Design a protein around this ligand. Structure first.
Ligand SMILES: [Zn+2]
Ligand SMILES: [Zn+2]
Lengths: 123, 123
DNA sequence: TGCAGGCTAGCCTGCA
DNA sequence: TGCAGGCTAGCCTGCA
């Protein structure tokens, strides 16, 4: 799929993994009208007020891509912002963000610009 | 698990696959009392009238073991009788067999002695 | 007890 | 349209 490569370029085994992660996000957001465009116009315009780009959330919270489970919001900020993003602990959400991680909504925002990075508040 | 090796010996990538198949059959039959013993006393006594050793059946019919889907009754006769067993077509069941493959029962007999081999009736 | 990971039934897709 | 296969949410387990 060219849309996967198209969105990927706007950012080894991790190189491969992010392709397989973006391919599943594209197959997810394709089903919802005006969503893959909304994510495109959000990874290109950085400071401008963006809307929510949301995939369904699991009972667990974790999203599995290519045999690796992990948090969806962490996974996409890891691709489109900080590959060294160690955990959900290093990611607070924006007030503009309607469906954040840690809300129990059956929709979760995968938008890497809807979450600002922080210093870990543990120990 | 030693019970897996214990049952396996009563019969490359196929060598590995049959271990992973017998490990899942053992974890399945362990849960049901007097079942793993019933399968042991059936792969050793060949001609003697054996009882049913049954695992639950899927909506599909297929059993997945180590990334490979396939028919449970085919899978176990492939381990404990004919590794060249090409398909369910080459396997008719015994009249003594209470839960055969092709009955729509939420239990299916994995007993390799409850099914006699045949010549394919197709084309 | 939060975190990580393995296994697979169900679901979806592609194919002759 | 029977047959094969890939992807994963849910489930289960092990661990400090
Ligand atoms: Zn949002
Ligand atoms: Zn039987």
């Amino acid at each position: 799929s060219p849309a996967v490569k198209r969105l990927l370029g706007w950012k080894d085994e991790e190189e491969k993994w992010a392709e397989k992660a973006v391919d599943a996000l594209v197959k997810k957001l394709k089903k919802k009208k005006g969503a893959m465009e909304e994510l495109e116009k959000a990874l290109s315009s950085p400071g401008q007020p963006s809307k929510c780009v949301t995939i369904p959330r699991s009972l667990d919270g974790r999203l599995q891509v290519s045999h690796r489970k992990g948090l969806p919001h962490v996974i996409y900020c890891r691709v489109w912002r900080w590959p060294d993003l160690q955990s959900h602990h290093e990611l607070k959400p924006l007030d503009i963000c309607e469906f954040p991680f840690g809300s129990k909504q059956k929709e979760v925002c995968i938008n890497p610009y809807h979450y600002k990075r922080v210093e870990s508040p543990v120990l």
